[PDB]
Amino acid sequence: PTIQQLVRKGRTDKISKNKTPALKGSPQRRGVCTRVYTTTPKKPNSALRKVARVRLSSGIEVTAYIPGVGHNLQEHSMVLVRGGRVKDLPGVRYKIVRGSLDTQGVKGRKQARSRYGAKKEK
Amino acid sequence: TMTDPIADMLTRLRNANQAYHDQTSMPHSKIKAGIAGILKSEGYIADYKVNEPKEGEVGKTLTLTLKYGENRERSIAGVRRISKPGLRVYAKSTALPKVLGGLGIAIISTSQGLLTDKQAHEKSVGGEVLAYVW
RNA sequence: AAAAUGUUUU
RNA sequence: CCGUAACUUUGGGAUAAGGGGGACCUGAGCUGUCGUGCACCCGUGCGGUGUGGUGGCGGUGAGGGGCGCAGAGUCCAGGGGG
RNA sequence: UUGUACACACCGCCCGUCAAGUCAUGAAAGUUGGUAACACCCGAAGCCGGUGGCCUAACCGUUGUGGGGGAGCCGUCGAAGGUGGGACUGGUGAUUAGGACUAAGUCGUAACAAGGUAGCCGUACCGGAAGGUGCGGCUGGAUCA
RNA sequence: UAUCAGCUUGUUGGUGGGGUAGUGGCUUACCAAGGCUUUGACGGGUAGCCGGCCUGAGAGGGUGACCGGCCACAUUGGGACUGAGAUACGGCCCAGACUCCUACGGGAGGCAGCAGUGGGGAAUAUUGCACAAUGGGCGGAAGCCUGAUGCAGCAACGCCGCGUGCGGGAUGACGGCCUUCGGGUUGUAAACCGCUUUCGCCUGUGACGAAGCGUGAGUGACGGUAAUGGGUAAAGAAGCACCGGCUAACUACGUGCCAGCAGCCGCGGUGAUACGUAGGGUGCGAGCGUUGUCCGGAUUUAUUGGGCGUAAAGGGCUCGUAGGUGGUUGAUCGCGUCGGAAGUGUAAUCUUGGGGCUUAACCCUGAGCGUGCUUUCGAUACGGGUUGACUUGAGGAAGGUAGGGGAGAAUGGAAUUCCUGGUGGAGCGGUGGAAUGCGCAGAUAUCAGGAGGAACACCAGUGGCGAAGGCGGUUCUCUGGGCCUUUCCUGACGCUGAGGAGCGAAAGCGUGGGGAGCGAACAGGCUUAGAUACCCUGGUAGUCCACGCUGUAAACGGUGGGUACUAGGUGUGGGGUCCAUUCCACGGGUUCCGUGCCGUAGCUAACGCUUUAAGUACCCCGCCUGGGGAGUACGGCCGCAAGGCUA
Numbered sequence A: 001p002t003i004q005q006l007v008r009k010g011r012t013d014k015i016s017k018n019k020t021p022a023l024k025g026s027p028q029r030r031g032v033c034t035r036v037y038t039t040t041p042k043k044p045n046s047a048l049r050k051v052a053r054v055r056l057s058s059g060i061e062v063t064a065y066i067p068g069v070g071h072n073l074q075e076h077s078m079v080l081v082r083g084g085r086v087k088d089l090p091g092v093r094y095k096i097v098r099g100s101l102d103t104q105g106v107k108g109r110k111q112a113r114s115r116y117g118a119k120k121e122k
Numbered sequence B: 001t002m003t004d005p006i007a008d009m010l011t012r013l014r015n016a017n018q019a020y021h022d023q024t025s026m027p028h029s030k031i032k033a034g035i036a037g038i039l040k041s042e043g044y045i046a047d048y049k050v051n052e053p054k055e056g057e058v059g060k061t062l063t064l065t066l067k068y069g070e071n072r073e074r075s076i077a078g079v080r081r082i083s084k085p086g087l088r089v090y091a092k093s094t095a096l097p098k099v100l101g102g103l104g105i106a107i108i109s110t111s112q113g114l115l116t117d118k119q120a121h122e123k124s125v126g127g128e129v130l131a132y133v134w
Numbered sequence C: 001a002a003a004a005u006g007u008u009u010u
Numbered sequence D: 001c002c003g004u005a006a007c008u009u010u011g012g013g014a015u016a017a018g019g020g021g022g023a024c025c026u027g028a029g030c031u032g033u034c035g036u037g038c039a040c041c042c043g044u045g046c047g048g049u050g051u052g053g054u055g056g057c058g059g060u061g062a063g064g065g066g067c068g069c070a071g072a073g074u075c076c077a078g079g080g081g082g
Numbered sequence E: 001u002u003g004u005a006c007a008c009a010c011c012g013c014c015c016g017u018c019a020a021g022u023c024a025u026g027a028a029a030g031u032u033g034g035u036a037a038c039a040c041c042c043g044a045a046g047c048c049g050g051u052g053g054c055c056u057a058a059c060c061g062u063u064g065u066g067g068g069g070g071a072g073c074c075g076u077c078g079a080a081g082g083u084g085g086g087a088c089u090g091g092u093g094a095u096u097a098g099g100a101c102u103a104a105g106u107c108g109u110a111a112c113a114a115g116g117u118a119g120c121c122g123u124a125c126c127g128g129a130a131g132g133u134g135c136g137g138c139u140g141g142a143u144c145a
Numbered sequence F: 001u002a003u004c005a006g007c008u009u010g011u012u013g014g015u016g017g018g019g020u021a022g023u024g025g026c027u028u029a030c031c032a033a034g035g036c037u038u039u040g041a042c043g044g045g046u047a048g049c050c051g052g053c054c055u056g057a058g059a060g061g062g063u064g065a066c067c068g069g070c071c072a073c074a075u076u077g078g079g080a081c082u083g084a085g086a087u088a089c090g091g092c093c094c095a096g097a098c099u100c101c102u103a104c105g106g107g108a109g110g111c112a113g114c115a116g117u118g119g120g121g122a123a124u125a126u127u128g129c130a131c132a133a134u135g136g137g138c139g140g141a142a143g144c145c146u147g148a149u150g151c152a153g154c155a156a157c158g159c160c161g162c163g164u165g166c167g168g169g170a171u172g173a174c175g176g177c178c179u180u181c182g183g184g185u186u187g188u189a190a191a192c193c194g195c196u197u198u199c200g201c202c203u204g205u206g207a208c209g210a211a212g213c214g215u216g217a218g219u220g221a222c223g224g225u226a227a228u229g230g231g232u233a234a235a236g237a238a239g240c241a242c243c244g245g246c247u248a249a250c251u252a253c254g255u256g257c258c259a260g261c262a263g264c265c266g267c268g269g270u271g272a273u274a275c276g277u278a279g280g281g282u283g284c285g286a287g288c289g290u291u292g293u294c295c296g297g298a299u300u301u302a303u304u305g306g307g308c309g310u311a312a313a314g315g316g317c318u319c320g321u322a323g324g325u326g327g328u329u330g331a332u333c334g335c336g337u338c339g340g341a342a343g344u345g346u347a348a349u350c351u352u353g354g355g356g357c358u359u360a361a362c363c364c365u366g367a368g369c370g371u372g373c374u375u376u377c378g379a380u381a382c383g384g385g386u387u388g389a390c391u392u393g394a395g396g397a398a399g400g401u402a403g404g405g406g407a408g409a410a411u412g413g414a415a416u417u418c419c420u421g422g423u424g425g426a427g428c429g430g431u432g433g434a435a436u437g438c439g440c441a442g443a444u445a446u447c448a449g450g451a452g453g454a455a456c457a458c459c460a461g462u463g464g465c466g467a468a469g470g471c472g473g474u475u476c477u478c479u480g481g482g483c484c485u486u487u488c489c490u491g492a493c494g495c496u497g498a499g500g501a502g503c504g505a506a507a508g509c510g511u512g513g514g515g516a517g518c519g520a521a522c523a524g525g526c527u528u529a530g531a532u533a534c535c536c537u538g539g540u541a542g543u544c545c546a547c548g549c550u551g552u553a554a555a556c557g558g559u560g561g562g563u564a565c566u567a568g569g570u571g572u573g574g575g576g577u578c579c580a581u582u583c584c585a586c587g588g589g590u591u592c593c594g595u596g597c598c599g600u601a602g603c604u605a606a607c608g609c610u611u612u613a614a615g616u617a618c619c620c621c622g623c624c625u626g627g628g629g630a631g632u633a634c635g636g637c638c639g640c641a642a643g644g645c646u647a
């Protein structure tokens, strides 16, 4: 565009889409497990991915993935929910922080323990 | 209609130099004559001449004769217009532009007449950055 | 001269 | 006197709805009209005309004030909206 | 050699209804809130403007008081509240609409080759659905030169 | 933010008065009708602003913690009082909401001061010490007050520094792990030998901050603190992430599209370097990862620094308003622009030179920076203002001139259909093949006469005209634009153009007319698994006319307008002018304006474009920012409706 066109109407940037609206500017949010279940992934994958409908303290209810082999949380279990997308799962944009509040660390972890909330074993 | 006769001079020179023409001609103006003079003094054209009208009998004609070196080699690597009519560019005595790392010359119209950057910097005078001929 | 279709391997 | 919706065929809907003031005493100026009278055009002897008159009558009144439970004080005289 | 949206290579690719599920969203008799004001009614404190018959040590007195002040009272303004009609906006809503994704469901084969009626654009009507047809246009078609 | 277009009536101005520290519609009376706004008023949304902070090559983008400056507020709303000074935090008055006391009559209160509690939250500390230092209030002073401040506690929250050992040690030991059963690897690692003592722990010494303060005596909260001597033992002191690619670092075992992993590409379906564990390794290290957020990479809003023929992107076309922009030249102004000077840009930060903490972080100090602004003095090349010329851009005059440019009216012929009559008789028609259909009530065919509507063969394309959409019988009437020309005239009057307005194929809509042919819908016949189609026979709106409406097209050259420049070659349309023979014209040239094809330089991702640019440049406008959702919803405008526009 001409300089006069830029003067009359300047450049405008893009919108910069948000990824995790339910957190509302917080690194993680507390919630209650309104439902605990399993979901079949999208193709080409195939499994029984463990997820939970959680009512976060922001008043929004979202689906959160439960990582790691092992699971204890059930109905009305208080959880901490952080960001994180599961690619082969449409509509899952949050994960549950293992080792925090009611959810507990994965039992037999010995590598990458901190990411699954497993205390070091003597 | 014609908007920037200086840009017309620059593009005429660029096109003629690219097409390997020995001479180019244009309607004459004082600032065009000054730019041609400093181009000749800096060695980018062989010579220049202002001709009294005898074909159109209307106005003076400025004619630039260019120089090509051994094996038909361009003496002008390019010319660019800086202070456009749409947006004019003025440079201070400290912020004078450098062309081709200093190899080329920026033509600056200062309050003391047309002066190449090197000159201006020596006189510590700025002005309107007309061209970047290199 | 008209004359349709071709699931999910691993 | 202020103000008034959905909708609309742009006319409406509408007095939509919903408000304020009103009478009495006093009253500054403003006006309708006539007026003896001033000068004047006078075609006068015209059954006239334009300036112009302190005043009379009437209309209207800002403001100020009085009294009562109540000032459209009686009779008369839409309820409204979806 | 030409065309192609095919390259799993025409036993290709691919379109839309219908049926099922999931998610987000629109409409909707209504219903439930919120915000910002408006026009009136009433109007505390208070300042200001009046008034003050009541109360008043300094001042002045013709030494019976007066001056000045104060309580009180009235008026304007005035927060809040009341009443009414609008404006904007959030949630929700029987019912309903299309969108996205998922069976490897059903119905045809519309497009891609001249896709077997060349395709597409605007518009119009028609039809379970793709689509069909008319009118004008385009080549992002071609036959025959 | 325009999916907010009108806002304001003490409102804008005037005069007199009042008021105030003070100007002022600040207030009041009177007079006038202003004031603001598409260069965005009014309304909605969000927000304390800045020095700075983060990021970035820079330009920018994000941000407003500590610290420092200004502002605003102190339970919510309002009000004044006192005072030099008041949003009066720890004041007063009233009202509202709250909490508390009450003998029920009435009273009391406001941590967004410091610490602290409840609550909310992913999340943020002690109900500490001292006025010794600096600052403040009052007092003549000693002094008193100071949750300012100086300090300490708490938290890896950040930054910085240090330690967890150092040298030697092959016999390359065991043990794990791997293996080709040879061995390899962990690994100089260990064992073993000799050393050192920072930090921690134990113990001793022990400050500065005070050139203060106090008449003196005396006087340090921090504080037995920092620093430092001695002692102990190599000890009390290493984890976290990762190892398919980007990306530094690989194998075995287990599992078998399961369990699971993932930032993207993807991995897992029996040989998984991608899951889980182990050995080994790599990056970091009192941290390491994950999540959130910001900038970068992203030239992915491109001023620096992008684009629009086919990738997303040229408005359907023109006219034209604001605006942007401006051929040659004289004079002048000195606003832009440029150069000095003065003032200012506090400090801190930041860059940098010195200095101090054992170094560093940090701290002090000098300078720079503070990218500007104001004042003032100069310069006049350019931009602009004022003013005067010039004619080449532009327009006009006169003459020449091409054409389906447009509107109106009359009118010509062929053909179709229908009608009437003659003739004649069995089919006609139609298709891939048929049938529906028509026809002995005489069709088809054939001839004559007539009626009517619509479109104009040949000319006619490789062409002309128009802003585009578009425009073809002939004639007349009315009318627009273009092209050329040497003289002539005006003298930059130019270009573009948001919003706005007009024009805008066909279909469609309204009223009336017309209706031959054609022909959506429709009916029937065929084809077919079906055939709401293709094909056939019928056939209504429509196609036509008048006047409106709609305003969209693959409205395409998918290429906005203007201008200048940059090889040619070769067709063709229009106007001149020149030449020879003519004294026509055939011909050649040449010039100006169109319209094609080929093609160089150049450009492009390629295809291709290439003087009619998609090349080289300047001016202005429109537009693009991944694909869908979607040119859809909501709102608004336009329309009779269909719908269109904005989005």
Ligand SMILES: [Mg+2]
Residues within 6 Å of the ligand: D014
């Ligand atoms: Mg009414």
Ligand SMILES: [Mg+2]
Residues within 6 Å of the ligand: D015
């Ligand atoms: Mg009424």
Ligand SMILES: [Mg+2]
Residues within 6 Å of the ligand: none
């Ligand atoms: Mg009265």
Ligand SMILES: [Mg+2]
Residues within 6 Å of the ligand: none
């Ligand atoms: Mg009454």
Ligand SMILES: [Mg+2]
Residues within 6 Å of the ligand: D076
């Ligand atoms: Mg009556």
Ligand SMILES: [Mg+2]
Residues within 6 Å of the ligand: E007
């Ligand atoms: Mg493919």
Ligand SMILES: [Mg+2]
Residues within 6 Å of the ligand: none
């Ligand atoms: Mg809704």
Ligand SMILES: [Mg+2]
Residues within 6 Å of the ligand: E043
């Ligand atoms: Mg009142």
Ligand SMILES: [Mg+2]
Residues within 6 Å of the ligand: none
């Ligand atoms: Mg008073």
Ligand SMILES: [Mg+2]
Residues within 6 Å of the ligand: none
């Ligand atoms: Mg008195």
Ligand SMILES: [Mg+2]
Residues within 6 Å of the ligand: none
């Ligand atoms: Mg009162």
Ligand SMILES: [Mg+2]
Residues within 6 Å of the ligand: none
């Ligand atoms: Mg109120």
Ligand SMILES: [Mg+2]
Residues within 6 Å of the ligand: E093
């Ligand atoms: Mg519902």
Ligand SMILES: [Mg+2]
Residues within 6 Å of the ligand: E109, E110, E115
């Ligand atoms: Mg098909």
Ligand SMILES: [Mg+2]
Residues within 6 Å of the ligand: E117
């Ligand atoms: Mg087809």
Ligand SMILES: [Mg+2]
Residues within 6 Å of the ligand: E126, E132, E133
């Ligand atoms: Mg049909």
